[PDB]
Amino acid sequence: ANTRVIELFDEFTDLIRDFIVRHEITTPEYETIMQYMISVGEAGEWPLWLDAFFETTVDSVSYGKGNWTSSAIQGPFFKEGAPLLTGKPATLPMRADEPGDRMRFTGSVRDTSGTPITGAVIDVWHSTNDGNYSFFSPALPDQYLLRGRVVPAEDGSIEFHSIRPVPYEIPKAGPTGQLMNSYLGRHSWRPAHIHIRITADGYRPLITQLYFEGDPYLDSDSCSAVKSELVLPVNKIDIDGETWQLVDFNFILQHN
Amino acid sequence: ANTRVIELFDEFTDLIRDFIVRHEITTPEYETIMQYMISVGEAGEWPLWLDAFFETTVDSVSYGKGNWTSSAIQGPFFKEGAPLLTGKPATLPMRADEPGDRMRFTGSVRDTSGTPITGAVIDVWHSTNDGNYSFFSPALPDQYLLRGRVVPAEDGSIEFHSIRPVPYEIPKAGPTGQLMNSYLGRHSWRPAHIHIRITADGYRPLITQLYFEGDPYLDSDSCSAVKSELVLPVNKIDIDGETWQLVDFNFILQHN
Ligand SMILES: Oc1cccc(O)c1O
Ligand SMILES: [Fe+3]
């Protein structure tokens, strides 16, 4: 017996019973709830459904804002052991002719005092423009595509190269899409994002997400996960007729 | 409804977010809840789980208080198409030497006024002395045993014969069970009960349960299903091994 759970569960039972009474939750209503949950099981979407609606809140109690980088959710599609990119310019493993424009990501990783953190590993992950993540779609191999680890050079600079990401929409036919589009008459679009996770000994882990300026769904996140201080300016440099989206974010890790 | 599901969701959401924020629910925590909700769904347990925690309250929303036979929960163990029983004695289909105490039930099915209701049809099921329901158990056939339909006489009266039910315990090593035993530090034991569903045209269908005096889990039912007015007083009588437990109860339903 955990007393954390005896205390949380019992309050939580007493709340939901009251919700039921306040809102006259009927039996067929009930049977539909029960039934919808079941089908969230079957599509394997519990982690999407919950993160969709609640990661944002658990992430607000979990970390604080100040003079460093802000956390943001991790969502459902992170995968461990993604591969070290070393290279002439390091480039997310990706497909022959992987759809989209070329994107150069530059930046640095440092502590709340300015010092650069040579001992860090940035994991990145993002979804094809087709709108799937590797390891989690039947439209993509269980391989590491668009996922990789980067390491600050000894002066703290980071830079990698990938496609530039575009607005993702949660499968409109899954339980989560269906609630979102139909039952809620809304939408299931997220704005484009690069997911980052940075770790370093001596520092507190960072899980966050970089967004893009003027993004269609900037204010519309069907996951409600956006924070302005993370909406990024894009710049457009040509080299041999070839249009790099340039982006640049400077990470601060907190100590301990 | 597009509009009903909206009012509730958005209210359910807010509630749930406030829970998370108030108790500062951590990320490991959140992920533990995520897994438990997965587990429950990979066992076949939403119906048992949800029924155990809230069907009582869902049921209170849908009947009233008052004179109407005092409702109870269907459980997750109903089964359509139990056989009409006639035989003069009128017993529930059971195996030879079907274990345990033989039991006799008397009573009636009247309306608000007290006028016998003839179109009533009444189903009764329960579980073995060993604690199994027909059809949901490898240790019994997928065939009607201790499940049946009985029709009232012209004057009110009703009789069916079975064996006496005894306390049932919810699987000790599945998620519900674990929650009830390992994380909550309690038990998964429901009090001896006999299920009932009564029906008539021009009347609001009825569902409920009868428990017995001295039943240990009366006052700590795991699914909080027990209403004092549905505890049956037991009259121990011995027609010399076998030994009859005789009970009686007076059903009433509401009109239209
Ligand atoms: O990073 C994400 C978080 C939540 C839902 C998603 O579809 C996603 O890509
Ligand atoms: Fe994402």
Side-chain angles (χ1 to χ4, degrees), chain A residues 1-87 89-241 243-256, chain B residues 1-64 66-167 169-235 237-253 256:
Chain A
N2 201 3
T3 123
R4 247 261 100 160
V5 215
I6 292 163
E7 275 169 325
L8 290 203
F9 192 67
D10 281 357
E11 195 197 58
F12 172 78
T13 45
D14 311 5
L15 265 72
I16 295 295
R17 285 161 176 154
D18 294 53
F19 187 86
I20 293 186
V21 189
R22 273 181 73 255
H23 294 275
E24 283 189 39
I25 289 174
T26 72
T27 306
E29 320 208 285
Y30 173 89
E31 269 148 23
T32 282
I33 283 148
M34 156 173 88
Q35 191 42 40
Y36 167 87
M37 301 187 81
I38 289 185
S39 53
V40 140
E42 311 189 303
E45 283 193 43
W46 269 127
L48 165 61
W49 201 96
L50 296 168
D51 296 356
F53 297 108
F54 308 130
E55 208 180 332
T56 312
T57 310
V58 330
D59 176 86
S60 74
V61 290
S62 130
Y63 208 89
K65 162 190 296 147
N67 74 261
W68 39 75
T69 306
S70 270
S71 66
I73 62 173
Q74 167 176 335
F77 305 109
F78 181 55
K79 186 80 189 208
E80 278 279 352
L84 184 40
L85 288 328
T86 35
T91 313
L92 297 220
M94 93 180 106
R95 291 125 89 210
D97 326 299
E98 180 70 47
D101 309 4
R102 315 170 160 81
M103 179 196 91
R104 171 177 180 99
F105 176 94
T106 46
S108 72
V109 324
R110 288 175 310 130
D111 76 14
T112 58
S113 309
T115 324
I117 314 164
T118 51
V121 310
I122 294 66
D123 253 78
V124 338
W125 64 111
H126 64 83
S127 84
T128 42
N129 296 145
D130 198 357
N132 302 320
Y133 284 100
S134 39
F135 293 104
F136 311 88
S137 164
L140 278 199
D142 281 0
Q143 288 291 317
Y144 285 97
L145 270 13
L146 303 177
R147 298 167 175 285
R149 297 186 170 162
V150 155
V151 291
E154 212 171 86
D155 52 61
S157 58
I158 43 173
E159 54 151 340
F160 68 70
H161 288 205
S162 145
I163 70 247
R164 138 135 187 191
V166 308
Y168 175 98
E169 98 169 327
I170 287 78
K172 300 219 264 259
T176 312
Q178 271 201 68
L179 168 63
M180 268 168 158
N181 293 290
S182 329
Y183 305 101
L184 296 175
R186 271 141 222 184
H187 73 248
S188 60
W189 288 85
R190 284 217 79 212
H193 52 276
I194 300 161
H195 289 265
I196 303 318
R197 172 182 78 197
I198 305 187
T199 78
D201 315 12
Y203 304 86
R204 240 172 274 161
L206 218 209
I207 288 148
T208 204
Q209 283 179 67
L210 278 14
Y211 300 103
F212 290 98
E213 214 142 37
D215 203 288
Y217 310 97
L218 214 59
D219 306 276
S220 224
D221 189 351
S222 70
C223 294
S224 351
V226 317
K227 296 155 168 194
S228 93
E229 71 255 40
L230 295 173
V231 167
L232 257 43
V234 200
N235 295 95
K236 26 203 160 170
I237 261 259
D238 247 346
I239 295 178
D240 333 337
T243 188
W244 290 91
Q245 322 271 150
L246 313 189
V247 54
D248 188 60
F249 184 95
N250 281 261
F251 301 96
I252 299 186
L253 279 42
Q254 339 204 13
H255 271 108
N256 304 347
Chain B
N2 231 100
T3 189
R4 178 73 159 165
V5 344
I6 295 178
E7 260 313 316
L8 291 162
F9 200 68
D10 271 339
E11 204 108 272
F12 168 69
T13 276
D14 309 1
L15 175 58
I16 303 295
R17 275 152 194 177
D18 192 53
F19 192 95
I20 287 155
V21 165
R22 271 153 45 215
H23 310 291
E24 294 176 62
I25 283 147
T26 56
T27 306
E29 292 192 4
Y30 176 69
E31 284 146 67
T32 289
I33 311 170
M34 186 181 282
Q35 296 340 294
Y36 182 91
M37 290 188 66
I38 280 163
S39 289
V40 174
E42 284 164 346
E45 251 180 60
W46 280 122
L48 173 79
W49 200 96
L50 287 171
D51 277 8
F53 294 121
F54 316 113
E55 171 165 53
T56 174
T57 319
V58 172
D59 262 21
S60 107
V61 178
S62 275
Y63 224 142
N67 2 294
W68 306 272
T69 265
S70 333
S71 192
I73 94 168
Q74 215 212 65
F77 289 135
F78 186 65
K79 228 305 157 158
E80 284 267 49
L84 202 300
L85 309 185
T86 26
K88 229 169 189 226
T91 319
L92 268 174
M94 45 198 273
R95 13 195 220 165
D97 305 25
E98 180 44 48
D101 281 348
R102 278 292 155 92
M103 166 196 74
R104 174 161 172 288
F105 173 100
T106 35
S108 33
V109 185
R110 302 177 153 111
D111 76 357
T112 32
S113 308
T115 133
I117 311 156
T118 49
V121 135
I122 120 166
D123 321 41
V124 30
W125 67 117
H126 64 260
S127 42
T128 40
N129 195 61
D130 220 56
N132 293 134
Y133 284 88
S134 51
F135 267 116
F136 301 98
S137 173
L140 290 184
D142 284 353
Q143 309 290 147
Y144 301 87
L145 296 158
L146 320 161
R147 335 182 71 119
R149 284 180 184 173
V150 161
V151 169
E154 162 141 332
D155 79 288
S157 20
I158 50 168
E159 207 163 11
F160 55 87
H161 274 211
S162 168
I163 49 94
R164 180 193 144 81
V166 284
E169 175 197 347
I170 309 142
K172 217 238 166 212
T176 278
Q178 291 287 254
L179 178 55
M180 260 163 176
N181 292 100
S182 178
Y183 326 118
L184 270 182
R186 274 167 193 153
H187 68 239
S188 48
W189 276 90
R190 275 224 54 199
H193 55 276
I194 94 207
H195 279 270
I196 281 96
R197 187 201 74 181
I198 308 185
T199 300
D201 282 1
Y203 285 79
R204 273 304 305 285
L206 176 102
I207 299 208
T208 183
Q209 293 179 35
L210 317 175
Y211 315 88
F212 314 67
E213 233 132 52
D215 186 328
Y217 307 79
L218 283 168
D219 287 279
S220 89
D221 182 351
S222 79
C223 306
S224 313
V226 197
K227 273 122 159 194
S228 286
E229 13 84 3
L230 264 42
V231 16
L232 252 38
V234 64
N235 200 185
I237 278 90
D238 313 67
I239 302 238
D240 301 307
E242 322 154 339
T243 91
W244 285 73
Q245 301 207 19
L246 318 170
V247 300
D248 174 60
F249 176 84
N250 295 298
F251 301 107
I252 309 158
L253 329 154
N256 228 62

